[PDB]
Symmetry: D2
Subunit: 144 residues, 4 copies
């Protein structure tokens, strides 16, 4: 293992109309909880990016139901739910030449949970640990 590196599902949603409901139905039937998701969409289709409670079980269920799914490495962090808090993290990263390809995040009461897909995963984790950023274990992320 790699510890703080989490598996994100990327799921190709064809049609529009449709398939997103069936995907959430596949996952419900397996008692797989969704922790975090974000759709990256275009005019015709979406891609569901997804943090789930059991990514390997979820992946095989989806393939079995004929979905196109890929797994991507991402890292979860927690910071205070106050103005400028995320700003401080991103400034640590950018000062070290580590850039965000995408991220998604919500405030959760007093903190905020952030999923990141960094330009360089080894370097990103290095900086964050160095700057004493709360990283989430992949397993913490899967049980939000």
């Amino acid at each position: 293992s790699n510890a703080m590196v989490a598996k994100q599902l990327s799921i190709f949603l064809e049609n529009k109309s449709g398939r997103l409901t069936e995907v959430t139905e596949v996952l419900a039937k397996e008692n797989i909880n969704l922790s975090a998701l974000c759709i990256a969409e275009n005019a015709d289709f979406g891609i569901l990016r997804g943090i789930v409670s059991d990514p390997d079980k979820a992946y095989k269920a989806l393939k079995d139901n004929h979905f196109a799914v890929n797994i991507t490495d991402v890292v979860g962090i927690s910071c205070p739910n106050v103005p400028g808090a995320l700003a401080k993290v991103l400034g640590f990263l950018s000062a070290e030449g580590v850039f965000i390809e995408y991220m998604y995040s919500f405030a959760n009461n007093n903190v905020a949970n952030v999923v990141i897909r960094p330009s360089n995963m080894d370097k990103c984790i290095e900086v964050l640990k160095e700057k004493k950023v709360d990283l989430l274990a992949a397993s913490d992320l899967y049980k939000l």
Copy 2:
């Protein structure tokens, strides 16, 4: 007003490297809290989609700092943080021909907060109220 309809900022992040840190710095300086965000990215640029604590103040600060920003109507909902919970909502919508253009969401302890951009905003809100889905007031969404 329109009540449950919230303002989402969409912010054009040029470069890659960069500009996301400056945007979060603009917002920090105004003591504007981020509630929820999601980047919809391509190979060159991103678009930061953003739920903030004061969208009008945030919008004018960003324009003042020469960002390209647009506001979009979205609706926030809350459901249980259990398997199939989101599934039930989406099935209500799709049974009524209301489809999701995009959404993003995180589990927040015992519930989950979901931001939706529906195919039809008037119809989406109608179905959800009818099916007794917890909608979030726009103001609830801005203070997560």
Copy 3:
């Protein structure tokens, strides 16, 4: 349905060094020509949007090779390859409130060929016929 409407292939490229090559090798092995293509991408993977010489045959060959492939209706038009030619077409559409979701075009010597995916195909086609834009037959788009 509509007259003139052509089948665009949308192929999930699961990424980023062929998979894409593999698509093009599957089509070449079938003696299927690419007339036009463009990739709509995010940070992790792309969607190849393609006009090909036989879309049903390409579909089958790509499905046989386990690609996720969808079909989308699009419309081909021609206009003079001169400044202002395309602008003149776009103004017909935008004055009748016809939105463009996406399009792709290249100058081809004396004409430009443009593939359009409008928000409403019915209204799009009506306005183009009415304003006498040169619509392509699907089979003319396929033989480029």
Copy 4:
């Protein structure tokens, strides 16, 4: 920098009925020709990616009209308009581990012209020179 590399305009289209028309009218009013274009879109707005006859002049005119416009390096190539021609180019790149972020191409009678944005321009150009692919000078891409 590299030899052969051309300037692609990436224009924020803030949406979805011109704004796009307005871009094309700004360029036509400057007597600037579009050689190639494609829109990379999401549900709310698009990004127009364009090759034009004078990219610095188009940039200035679009900035003068308050568009958010960025410049990206891309590379133009030609290949025979026959099945397998493009596949042959893509296999050179993918065998040397060169990833394609996006590309767009149309068959132009006897050749196809392809605009490529690779993940690493240096390595891309090296492999194309070496394997003798027909690279376009920027000024040849601009005069299509």
